Design a protein around this ligand. Sequence first.
Ligand SMILES: [Cl-]
Ligand SMILES: [Cl-]
Ligand SMILES: [Cl-]
Ligand SMILES: [Cl-]
Ligand SMILES: [Cu+]
Ligand SMILES: [Cu+]
Lengths: 308, 313
Amino acid sequence: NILEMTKNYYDRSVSPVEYAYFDQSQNMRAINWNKIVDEKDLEVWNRVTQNFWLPENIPVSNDLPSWNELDDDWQQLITRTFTGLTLLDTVQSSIGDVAQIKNSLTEQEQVIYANFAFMVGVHARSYGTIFSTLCTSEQIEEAHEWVVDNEALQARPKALIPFYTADDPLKSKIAAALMPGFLLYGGFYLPFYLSARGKLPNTSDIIRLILRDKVIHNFYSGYKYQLKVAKLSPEKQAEMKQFVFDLLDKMIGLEKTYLHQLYDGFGLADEAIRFSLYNAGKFLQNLGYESPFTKEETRIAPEVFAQL
Amino acid sequence: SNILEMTKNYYDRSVSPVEYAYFDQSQNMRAINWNKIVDEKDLEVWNRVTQNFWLPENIPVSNDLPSWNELDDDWQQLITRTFTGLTLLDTVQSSIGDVAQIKNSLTEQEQVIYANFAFMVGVHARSYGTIFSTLCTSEQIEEAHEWVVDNEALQARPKALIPFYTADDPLKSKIAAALMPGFLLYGGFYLPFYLSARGKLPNTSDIIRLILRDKVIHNFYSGYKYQLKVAKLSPEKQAEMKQFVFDLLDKMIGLEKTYLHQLYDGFGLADEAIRFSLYNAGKFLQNLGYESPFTKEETRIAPEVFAQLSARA
Ligand SMILES: [Cl-]
Ligand SMILES: [Cl-]
Ligand SMILES: [Cl-]
Ligand SMILES: [Cl-]
Ligand SMILES: [Cu+]
Ligand SMILES: [Cu+]
């Protein structure tokens, strides 16, 4: 016989966030960082916290010479693109990441998504630091007006936010992965294109610090998606895969319209979209699915890939 | 004719994403503007809390092993229990409290500052794990978690605050958000400072001071935003909210006194810890813009303990 003198505290208690939103049948347990359910959580926690950075760390002032070499058209494109990325980071920091907390599989995940919310806030702030150093007050104001009135740009966050505010945690998680995994890469093409040609090298250092976080954010949300979806019936799993491909198809549609409008005048649209679709493929892979994208429609110039 | 607006500025015909998400989908969304800051206080607080970034790995807790090993099983148990209880409160604030504030922000930057608070209060909870990892046995750690779950006096306190976080009233939510860093953990913080005043667990007290360096600003900030918001109510509804703040604090003091008596009576620390608690209840009210109704005698702290609190870094 196995004598169980007492019942384990963990299995007869709930985390505070579960108690707040889902289940008040039992008392609350403090987070246990000494008895960790999933080692992956500790791995991710250690990496993202050790990778802490602020845009003040980077000497953007040194980009002044190369910035001054860029025509007014190019300076406007960069300010607009980056203000567009600032909107996506604002959406993700203030809504996306914090929405994931209550849907966590583990205690540590609740704290990791709090880190994500803060750090995606830092990404948004970093564009502010670049503009502060390089842009005129007029260029900054123009870009904000341009973002507010750009329907093609607005359609992308408008399509994802409903999944965050709705009560389907798997659809929320897919949206949460889609932001760092796909939606910003069309924008990140521009600084990598420029740095490959020797322009704005210090700005591209900030972009790489953002990417170092965003690749982990994509991996982590995709990993948690795969854990949860694996527990559903074959039929439910087939419905969720269909939803993922349907949502990505819509988002690719909306991104292609926005990038054409953004880049067609500069001759960068086709290149940016292939860069976008390459990352759409990696997004699908991080969700445990296969990329249906061709070699031809995902081709990236070596020097751009090198900046990546 | 003379005053007609032909160009409406972007800001006043757009909403932040969180406003769009939960309140109003009629207007397009504006990206955060860090180049035209509405409240300079937000930038000062942002710069301070980000510059004050720390991880518990930074403190050599293993240097506490000698002083820890001098404390008997009863004292080691009390410390593990007390800190697991503070871990619960930090978990509540990080996972519910701080993130609930984001959508009720007055400014764009405030939305990002509360994201920082959520994360750093997560770091506070994690730091107790680091202390336990170094000092405590598996048995002590698990014992403390069981004790927290089954301690009704402990549980009553967070159970009283969470409803304000999940409810609709953003002013009542903000009061709870100030009350957690301002008041509810200080009863527990007395213990490490009592010990380090006597040269016991000095490295643990450095972690407590790094936590407090954050908590003090969190209390100040939530208090500052509370004052800006209540100033926009009729004098009648101002008097009504003030009464609520005093009624809530009165209730929370009652629950805290019960918990601290149960926690400390056996160790003869209950009276001193409650005085320490009421001293910080005073600071909480002052940070909401009210006067402390507590006496010098009610809030007396031994100088050597106050030296540990007010010490820097
Ligand atoms: Cl992101
Ligand atoms: Cl994210
Ligand atoms: Cl707090
Ligand atoms: Cl807080
Ligand atoms: Cu992210
Ligand atoms: Cu706090």
